[PDB]
Amino acid sequence: VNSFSGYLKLTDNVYIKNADIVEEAKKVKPTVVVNAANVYLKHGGGVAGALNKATNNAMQVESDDYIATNGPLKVGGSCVLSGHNLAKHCLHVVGPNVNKGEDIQLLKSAYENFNQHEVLLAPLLSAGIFGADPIHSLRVCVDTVRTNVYLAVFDKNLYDKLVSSFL
Ligand SMILES: O[C@@H]1CCN(c2ncnc3[nH]ccc23)C1
């Protein structure tokens, strides 16, 4: 039993809700919140910009030190950093950005990072400003993640479409 509330159950392990991931994280304080990161951990917009703003830029400060030490992530890769005031940990995961011409097959690799964590709050990878089809992202999520994932879909209109089209 966990403290996530109001989710629709899609499969044995995937749950979905129309919600703002920032406000959800602040309420639940999950062990792991997933960020929709880029390889440089430049949290400008989308989910990343919103999470960083909620940390008063502490996420960006920590991220800049991470990059200075380690260099960029790989597309499809991830790193674990602090969750600041939002969660114990933040798993920064880089899904392909279609608006940069990145390979969509890497979306499965991106979701595989979730399997290293027993429970996560997460967005649909590569959705929103990353330019992928959210229905496809949800399909890859369900077919790749085996751990317990609580998906927050910000757009209510998008949430309703995701539920009604789910196979
Ligand atoms: O890529 C799409 C576009 C934005 N996005 C989000 N998902 C869940 N919570 C969020 N809060 C702020 C943005 C956001 C997914």
Side-chain angles (χ1 to χ4, degrees), residues 86-165:
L86 303 178
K88 188 168 191 289
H89 305 286
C90 179
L91 181 68
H92 296 271
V93 180
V94 183
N97 189 324
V98 180
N99 304 318
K100 300 180 182 176
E102 295 170 352
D103 189 4
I104 194 63
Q105 311 297 311
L106 290 170
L107 186 54
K108 188 174 184 73
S109 301
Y111 274 117
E112 287 170 343
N113 294 286
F114 289 25
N115 290 322
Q116 301 294 317
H117 303 277
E118 286 201 320
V119 184
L120 315 87
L121 175 61
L124 290 169
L125 297 180
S126 298
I129 68 178
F130 280 63
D133 179 2
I135 300 177
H136 178 63
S137 183
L138 177 56
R139 187 73 261 168
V140 177
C141 181
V142 163
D143 293 342
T144 304
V145 181
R146 299 177 300 284
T147 55
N148 291 328
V149 56
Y150 290 83
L151 290 168
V153 180
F154 176 65
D155 189 63
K156 167 56 173 174
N157 284 331
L158 178 56
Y159 170 76
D160 284 348
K161 182 188 183 188
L162 286 166
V163 167
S164 295
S165 60

Side-chain angles (χ1 to χ4, degrees), residues 26-47:
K26 283 193 285 186
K27 182 72 173 184
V28 175
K29 310 236 200 305
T31 303
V32 180
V33 67
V34 174
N35 182 31
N38 59 50
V39 297
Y40 309 108
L41 303 180
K42 289 303 183 197
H43 309 303
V47 168

